[PDB]
Amino acid sequence: QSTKNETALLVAKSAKSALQDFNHDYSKSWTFGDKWDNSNTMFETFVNKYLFPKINETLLIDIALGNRFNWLAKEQDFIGQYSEEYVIMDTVPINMDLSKNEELMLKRNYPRMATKLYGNGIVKKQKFTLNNNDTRFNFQTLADATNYALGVYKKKISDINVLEEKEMRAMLVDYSLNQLSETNVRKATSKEDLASKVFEAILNLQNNSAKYNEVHRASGGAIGQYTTVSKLKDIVILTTDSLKSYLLDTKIANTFQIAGIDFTDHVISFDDLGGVFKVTKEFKLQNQDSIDFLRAYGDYQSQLGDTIPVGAVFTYDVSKLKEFTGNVEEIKPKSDLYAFILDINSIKYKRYTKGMLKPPFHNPEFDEVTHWIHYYSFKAISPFFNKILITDQ
Amino acid sequence: MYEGNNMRSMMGTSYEDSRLNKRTELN
């Protein structure tokens, strides 16, 4: 429906707005004003029905958004790109069959090795741009503009934290699914079943097992075995928060001897274990609304025709775009029934944030100030430690 | 109102407005 109210027609006449005085290279330079009415609007007072309304305050609601990981954050010093480690595989000893000829003691036996070569990290970048012309047409005082410029900076150093948090949980759920081949998955059957099966799996960390690790995709550890235990000061279990809620209201509640058997200190959790996405099929960008949707999240640098490599991530709901269906797959657990247990010092997280802020760039020919943020993160999973998945497969 | 690190680089000083020095010539 429409409205025949004349001041509603005044609001609807967007030709006299300030937006038309910046899109075009020329404009009007004088204003005659207009008779503003308040009557038959949502803007009446009782006494003075001819004044433009007033705003008394804004408050700039901001939240600080932590990391939940940065005791993992150790700092290399940005030199070199390839790092690796390695183990020696086991050799079961052999019986003394003395019938063999004595000159085999001249023949040699080199020890065997399995390495895992990692490679470079990745550098993350974002821009933001403080204007001096359009943005101060708001902000009835300058103090609100200063709080605005401070708060956009504080939230653009909080978003990097929530970003690397969700892509860490992305990376180890992806390692939980596409790696960790056949033995160390365990099929539960219910939301209480895996509650028992997790400390079934706890105390399987601490037997000397050639299983439970991921040696069989190393360099030289394709054939052979390798045994490693854990220490229980080192194990990290993760799951949905609903699972640890069911733990903390059911088993440590309705039982009676929980003086020692409570493993809940090593339980980190999340609300949902997927908002993240993985590229397949190596598409390109074709459609306008796709990159317009990318502009809503800060992704400015991609245009139409720009390719996407298969190893990238997208960290928010992007698969609903028409150009990504079939190409893009969500890293998520299958059944909302998830418990991935490992040990710490099996994940490697290592970032470089020393030269983090860059000097600001002042653009006088449109009067803005632009800031960049750079940091060099690296993360991987070392495959030489005991890990167990529990889902419904 | 809240400062944190308020006087940061060039834009946080550019709203804390700067240097009315040059005005137009007659008055």
Partner: protein, 55 residues
Amino acid sequence: AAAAAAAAAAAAAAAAAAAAAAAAAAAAAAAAAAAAAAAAAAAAAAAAAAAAAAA
């Protein structure tokens, strides 16, 4: 000398929870003996069969 409750668990793949207890199904509110019984569902099915046999 105890009991349990689910309000879930459609009794297809439950393995080791309890015996001689009550497992509240999502529809039927089953009872777990050495084999699982379906008491309230048995009452509803007996009512439906007694209605069907009223020809």
